[PDB]
Amino acid sequence: GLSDGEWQLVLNVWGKVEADVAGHGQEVLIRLFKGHPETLEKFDRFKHLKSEDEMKASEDLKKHGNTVLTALGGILKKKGHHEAELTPLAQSHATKHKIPVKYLEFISEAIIQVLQSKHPGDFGADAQGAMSKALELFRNDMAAKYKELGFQG
Numbered sequence: 603g604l605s606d607g608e609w610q611l612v613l614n615v616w617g618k619v620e621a622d623v624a625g626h627g628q629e630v631l632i633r634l635f636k637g638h639p640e641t642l643e644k645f646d647r648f649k650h651l652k653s654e655d656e657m658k659a660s661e662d663l664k665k666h667g668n669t670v671l672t673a674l675g676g677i678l679k680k681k682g683h684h685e686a687e688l689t690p691l692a693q694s695h696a697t698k699h700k701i702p703v704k705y706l707e708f709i710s711e712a713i714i715q716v717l718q719s720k721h722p723g724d725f726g727a728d729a730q731g732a733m734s735k736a737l738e739l740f741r742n743d744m745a746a747k748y749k750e751l752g753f754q755g
């Protein structure tokens with residue numbers, strides 16, 4: 603799974619995200635949207651955004667960013683014993699928002715992109731390794747809840 607070591611590496615980086623959750627949150631959405639624009643159409647609420655600047659000015663794009671990462675950090679914190687935190691997520695995304703898993707891959711990549719950007723120092727070869735596996739765990743588990751809800755896969 604993740605070694606005990608791999609978890610503490612994960613939890614160390616995340617201590618960085620927790621000093622600025624709304625700020626990290628906002629960049630990962632803009633990352634996502636400007637990297638894979640199609641993702642944007644999934645948000646009624648942000649489809650009105652026509653540029654990065656308009657994305658950076660958006661107070662609600664910021665609040666939503668804080669919501670994604672607060673919720674991803676309560677999961678990460680469980681260090682793979684996240685069953686109760688993941689279900690509802692998998693429920694809304696699968697049954698209400700209709701998010702394909704590949705989209706989950708997309709945001710995973712934007713999240714590494716943001717850490718790599720803001721914390722090169724704090725995010726070396728090992729923290730990179732740790733985080734990428736913490737996210738693939740998260741993706742795998744979403745995927746499988748998907749599959750059980752009889753959704754797309």
Ligand code: HEM
Binds near residue numbers: 666
């Ligand atoms: C790290 C992965 C993600 C996490 C933790 C996350 C978290 C959430 C949370 C906590 C909410 C509010 C409660 C709910 O409706 O579930 C939400 C809503 C939403 N999510 Fe996600 N999300 C993730 C990935 C995605 C992706 C990739 C997309 C689209 C490509 C997306 C689309 C949506 C939409 C369309 C909504 C409703 C937005 C709103 O009106 O608040 N989510 N998400």
